[PDB]
Design a protein around this ligand. Structure first.
Ligand SMILES: OC[C@@H]1[C@@H](O)[C@H](O)[C@@H](O)c2[nH]c(CCc3ccccc3)c[n+]21
Length: 489
């Protein structure tokens, strides 16, 4: 047996754009992502699958079913987001003498008057529906982490096709301080409407992926798919201050904890001569970001400064984790290696002989202990495992994947790290971004024709974990690697 603290909670994470649509009435055409995945050119290019989010799992209408199953599964925590675009579908008038050429946004003044003004622009059907959703959630005994942002932006703030095309005269998303400014106000507004229902807050989900795949990893088909190192840095600088400003915005209406959710891989050396490479990879992918929002330490221009408006803007750390990245030393620096972590063949075996998922991601639960303990030793901020899961429609590997990673969380707590929950990605299948519906991450299978949910055997296994607050003696063998011999190589 691996017993968890009585206060530790097991649950799930879910995104608005991925899970809400599918039931008639739920359609939100008002995002960069919606437009992006409907784009004729993007479809023909193969950048997007052709699958459309409006044929999704229908959480908007069927949320009670979702919550019933979650409660049966013994789940006690849930993290999801409101979709900005649902609340503010229509352009807001430009800020009164806010200087959109200024690079830094060191404060955004928000008060009851400014909030009442926004209130007259807000879609009230959308707010009432969310209140209905979150009320049912809460009535099922679920502790509630509300995230403000999980990728899609209002179209009035970002036309992604225009930017893809090389036109920067329009709404430019994270490239514009206007977005930073409106984001601080959206966060404060949501906290102001929903604080009575909410337990903890997250500003954003994996801002690093938004800026990294949006402007560098362009084959991933993420908006706006404009290839530029410079602009990726600009997007990331803006998202950092958008975090800090959202933090201050929420904290002016709430005393409740405000954190952030971030994409992590466990960096691992190719050989024992590659450990500096591991540290450099951690600096470049993790510490630079967190040292900014925690310690105020950012490199702007070519200079290391401390920004007082950035410092101390975080109460907790959302740890998202799926797999490792193997890195080696280069004379010029370091490189990640294909054939490991997220760069493997689908339904096969890594270069290390470890099985890969429907998405080609390598089985590596060790990495979660590494990421949890490294954060803790550096910052001493408590954490939730806000995402962990596997693309696996057949359910072959998920039982082992689930128990193995839950074990690494127990391991981490055993070492002293303050981890207060594990939230599986996800409860049910959903729209996997540019990949469409074929990547299936749920403990529950979705039949998309009928919107019916089924319990994969892994769901039954998770129910054992959750109702017992433990990896029980009877499922403890699943803390191991799925046998590869019966699997595809
Ligand atoms: O891919 C499964 C889930 C998505 O459905 C979520 O919306 C998103 O939060 C999400 N992020 C990741 C990890 C992505 C990653 C990329 C590069 C490096 C490390 C992690 C996996 N997932």
């Amino acid at each position: 047996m691996y017993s968890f603290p009585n206060s530790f909670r097991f649950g799930w994470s879910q995104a608005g754009f991925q899970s809400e649509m599918g039931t008639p009435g739920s359609e939100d055409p008002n995002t960069d992502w919606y437009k992006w995945v409907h784009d004729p050119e993007n479809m023909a290019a193969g950048l997007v699958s052709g699958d459309l989010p409006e044929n999704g799992p229908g959480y908007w209408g069927n949320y009670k079913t979702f919550h019933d199953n979650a409660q049966k599964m013994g789940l006690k925590i849930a993290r999801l987001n409101v979709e900005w675009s649902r609340i503010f579908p229509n352009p807001l008038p430009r800020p009164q003498n806010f200087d959109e050429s200024k690079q830094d946004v060191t404060e955004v003044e928000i008060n009851e008057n400014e909030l009442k003004r926004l209130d007259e622009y807000a879609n009230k059907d959308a707010l009432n529906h969310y209140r209905e959703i979150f009320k049912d959630l809460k009535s099922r005994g679920l502790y509630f982490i509300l995230n403000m942002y999980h990728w899609p932006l209002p179209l009035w703030l970002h036309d992604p096709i225009r930017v893809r095309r090389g036109d920067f005269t329009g709404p430019s998303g994270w490239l514009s301080t206007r977005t930073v400014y409106e984001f601080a106000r959206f966060s404060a507004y949501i906290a102001w409407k929903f604080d009575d229902l909410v337990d903890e807050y997250s500003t954003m989900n994996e801002p690093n992926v938004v800026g990294g795949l949006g402007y560098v990893g362009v084959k991933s088909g993420f908006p706006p798919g404009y290839l530029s190192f410079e602009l990726s840095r600009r997007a990331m600088y803006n998202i950092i201050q958008a975090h800090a400003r959202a933090y201050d915005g929420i904290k002016s209406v709430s005393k409740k904890p405000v954190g952030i959710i971030y994409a992590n891989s466990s960096f691992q050396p190719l050989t024992d001569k590659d450990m500096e490479a591991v540290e450099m990879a951690e600096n470049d992918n993790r510490w630079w970001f967190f040292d900014a929002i925690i310690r105020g330490e950012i490199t702007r221009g070519n200079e290391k400064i401390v920004r007082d408006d950035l410092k101390g803007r975080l109460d907790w750390i959302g740890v998202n984790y799926y797999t490792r990245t193997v890195v080696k030393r280069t004379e010029k620096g370091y490189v990640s290696l294909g054939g490991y972590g997220h760069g493997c063949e689908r339904n096969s075996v890594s270069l290390a002989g470890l099985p890969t998922s429907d998405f080609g991601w390598e089985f590596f639960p060790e990495g979660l202990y590494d990421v949890l303990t490294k954060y803790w030793n550096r910052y001493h901020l408590y954490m939730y495992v806000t995402e962990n899961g596997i693309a696996d429609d057949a359910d072959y590997q998920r039982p082992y994947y689930l128990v193995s990673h839950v074990y690494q969380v127990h391991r981490a707590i055993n070492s002293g790290a303050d981890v207060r929950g594990y939230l599986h990605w996800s409860l049910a299948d959903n729209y996997e971004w540019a990949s469409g519906f074929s990547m299936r991450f749920g403990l529950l299978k979705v039949d998309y024709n009928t919107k019916r949910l089924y319990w994969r055997p892994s769901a039954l296994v998770y129910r054992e974990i959750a109702t017992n607050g433990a990896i029980t003696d009877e499922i403890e063998h699943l803390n191991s690697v799925p046998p590869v011999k019966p699997l595809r190589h």
